[PDB]
Amino acid sequence: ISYAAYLNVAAQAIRSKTELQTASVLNRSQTDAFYTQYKNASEPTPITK
């Protein structure tokens, strides 16, 4: 964990009442991004960050 990422966990506890939990709130609390370290060409497992 880091100062950016730490803040995010306290920004997803802040984010998670279902009534003020508007549509573009649930969006911000999700991500479909896979990180892949690329050697040489390619390398290891793509993991869901």
Partner: protein
């Protein structure tokens, strides 16, 4: 030259048309939602990078992060940005590279396979969020050790209008580089808990969100623009093939009739 061919060659294009015409409106609905994230992002950055302006902060190995997305059909967004990285990256064939969005990868992968050490995926769907901006930052610190670099640079497309854009560069300074500045003493920062450490890590996250938000809205404007030109260009072919269709259809009725006629005469 046969009806079946011309009728189905028409049915490929008529959908290509209708589809490209849909994603121009889906692009237009997405337009405002994203002009909004660009405004909210800048406004946050304006409060953060104003400190760096006062401290008159400059730069005493390298990390390059270039931002676009996964999806094409947005004109030359991925191309002339990739090209901006080529122009700058001539001075540094040893600068480590992290790419955000697969299209800048296949651009930079084919030009420099080795510099790319990291690549991010599934980016240009919805507008960028802080979580994305953050966790990408997190990994830039993790395996890429972003802290241990002399100079850091973010590459992204700034949107100037809804018709053009400019591939831009902006720098990132680290814990160390913030301290040894022309005017660190202007501010009464407490020199106790690792502050420059944080202002760097917090900025790494932020200045990316702001680069992505701008890169996204540039992309979204470029989509609605490329698709307008396409749907236009499609319709043109639909027009040219509706005419060929019609010729062929007439020809088919005549030619069929001549066989019936020859057959009847004997």
């Amino acid at each position: 030259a046969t009806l079946k061919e011309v009728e189905m060659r028409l049915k490929s294009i008529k959908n290509i048309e209708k589809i490209t015409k849909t994603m121009k409106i889906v692009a237009s609905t997405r337009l405002s939602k994203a002009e909004k994230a660009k405004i909210s992002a800048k406004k946050m950055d304006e409060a953060e990078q104003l400190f760096y302006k006062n401290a008159e902060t400059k730069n005493l190995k390298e990390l390059i992060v270039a931002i676009t997305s996964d999806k094409g059909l947005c004109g030359s967004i991925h191309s002339q940005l990739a090209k901006a990285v080529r122009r700058h990256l001539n001075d540094q064939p040893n600068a480590d590279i992290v790419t955000i969005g697969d299209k800048i990868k296949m651009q930079l992968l084919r030009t420099h396979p080795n510099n790319i050490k990291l690549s991010i995926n599934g980016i240009g769907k919805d507008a960028p969020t802080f979580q994305e901006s953050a966790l990408i930052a997190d990994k830039l610190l993790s395996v890429m050790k972003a802290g241990t670099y002399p100079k850091i640079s973010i590459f992204y497309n700034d949107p100037v209008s809804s018709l053009s854009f400019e591939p831009s560069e902006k720098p990132i300074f680290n814990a160390k580089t913030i301290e040894q500045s022309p005017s660190f003493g202007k501010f009464e920062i407490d020199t106790d808990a690792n502050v420059p450490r944080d202002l760097f890590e917090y900025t790494l996250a932020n200045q990316m969100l702001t680069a992505m938000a701008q890169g996204y809205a540039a992309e979204i404007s470029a989509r609605r623009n490329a698709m307008d030109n396409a749907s236009k260009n499609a319709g043109d072919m639909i027009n040219r093939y509706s005419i060929l269709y019609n010729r062929t259809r007439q020809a088919v009725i005549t030619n069929e009739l001549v066989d019936i006629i020859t057959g009847a005469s004997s």
